[PDB]
Design a protein around this ligand. Structure first.
Ligand SMILES: [Mn+2]
Length: 312
C-alpha cells in the first residue's frame, strides 16, 4: 500500500516462501534477524498454577517444559510455541471440523450431514460443506450485526476446549479465567486477514487466547495507530498467542498462510499419532481412522484458528 503496516502486509502477502524474503520474521521455535529477533524476551509462566495432572488431562506438556516469550514494546503479549503432547493437535482439529461446527452452535453456513458428506467426498475420486465452512461461534454467540454478546443467545461452552483454554490462561497468570465465548476460523492458502483492532470493550484486563493448527501463517503485530511498522512472526501448528491489557488495543494482521514447502503436505509436528490408549480422566478422546483421513486431507491446504475469551 503506502503506510508502514500496509507496505509490510503486502510484502508478506506476496513473499516467496523458502527465500530470504522471510529472514526478518521471528520464529519463536528457533529460540540473527536484526530488528525483529532482538526484541524477543522470556515471558515467565506460573508453573505451579497448572498441576501435571491438569496439563496431562488437557493434552499438554507439563508447564515446566513450556517456553513462553514476549516482545520488547508489546506489553501483555505472550507467545507459546506448540506445547501440545504429540498427537493431541489432531483431537482439537477433529473437534473443530466435526463437532463444534454442528448446528447446536452457529456457523456461516446456517451426504447432507457435514461430516458424513466429507467422509464420502474423500472416497469419491477428486464444493463440500466442510470446504465452505469459514467461521463457527461457541459459548456466548457473537452477533455480527449487533456487535455484542447476549445471555439469550448462547450454547454451553465445549467443556474440553474450555478446560484447555483455562489451563493456558492459568499458566500465563490469569488463574481466574473463564472460557465463555469462542470464535473458530477456517482458512485457505489464499486467505488473508486485514489490518484491524479487535473491537473495544471497556475492560481489556482479561486475556484473549488464540490457538493455530495446520499450515503456518505470518502474523503482524503493530502499534496503537495504523502507521507504526509491525513486527512479523510465524504462527506454526500448535502455537498459542495470548493478548491481554495493552496488547489488545494494538493493530494486527495475518497477511499470509504459507503453503507446505512441497505444495501440499502437513507440518512435522502433526506426523505423530494420537496415542492408542488414552487416560480415563482425559478431556481428549480417540480419533478414528476415517475421521483422521478427513482431517489430514483438509489440513494439507488449511489453517484452523480458535479464539477464546471471557465476556461476562
Ligand atoms: Mn484480531
Amino acid at each position: 500500500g503506502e503506510d508502514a503496516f500496509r507496505k509490510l502486509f503486502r510484502f508478506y502477502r506476496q513473499s516467496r516462501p523458502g527465500t530470504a524474503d522471510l529472514e526478518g520474521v521471528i520464529d519463536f521455535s528457533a529460540a540473527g534477524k536484526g530488528p525483529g529477533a532482538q526484541k524477543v524476551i522470556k515471558s515467565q509462566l506460573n508453573v505451579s498454577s497448572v498441576s501435571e495432572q491438569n496439563a496431562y488431562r488437557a493434552g499438554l506438556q507439563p508447564v515446566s517444559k513450556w517456553q513462553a516469550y514476549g516482545l520488547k514494546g508489546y506489553p501483555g503479549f505472550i507467545f507459546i510455541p506448540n506445547p501440545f503432547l504429540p498427537g493431541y493437535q489432531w483431537h482439537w482439529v477433529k473437534q473443530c471440523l466435526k463437532l463444534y461446527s454442528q448446528k447446536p452452535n452457529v456457523c456461516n453456513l446456517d451426504t447432507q450431514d457435514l461430516w458424513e458428506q466429507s467422509k464420502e467426498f474423500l472416497r469419491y475420486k477428486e464444493r463440500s460443506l466442510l470446504e465452505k465452512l469459514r467461521w463457527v461461534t461457541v459459548g456466548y454467540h457473537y452477533n455480527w450485526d449487533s456487535k455484542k454478546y447476549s445471555a439469550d443467545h448462547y450454547t454451553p461452552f465445549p467443556s474440553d476446549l474450555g478446560f484447555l483454554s483455562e489451563q493456558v490462561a492459568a499458566a500465563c497468570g490469569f488463574e481466574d479465567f473463564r472460557a465463555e465465548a469462542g470464535i473458530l476460523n477456517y482458512y485457505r492458502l489464499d486467505s488473508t486477514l486485514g489490518i484491524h483492532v479487535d473491537r473495544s470493550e471497556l475492560d481489556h484486563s482479561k486475556p484473549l487466547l488464540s490457538f493455530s493448527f495446520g499450515q503456518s501463517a505470518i502474523f503482524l503485530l503493530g502499534g496503537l495507530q495504523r502507521d507504526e511498522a509491525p513486527t512479523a512472526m510465524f504462527m506454526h501448528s500448535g502455537d498459542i498467542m495470548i493478548m491481554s491489557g495493552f496488547s489488545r488495543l494494538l493493530n494486527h494482521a495475518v497477511p499470509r498462510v504459507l503453503p507446505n514447502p512441497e505444495g501440499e503436505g502437513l507440518p512435522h509436528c502433526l506426523e505423530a499419532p494420537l496415542p492408542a490408549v488414552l487416560p480415563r480422566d482425559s478431556m481428549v478422546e480417540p480419533c478414528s481412522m476415517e475421521d483422521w483421513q478427513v482431517c489430514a486431507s483438509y489440513l494439507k491446504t488449511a489453517r484452523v484458528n480458535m479464539t477464546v475469551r471471557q465476556v461476562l
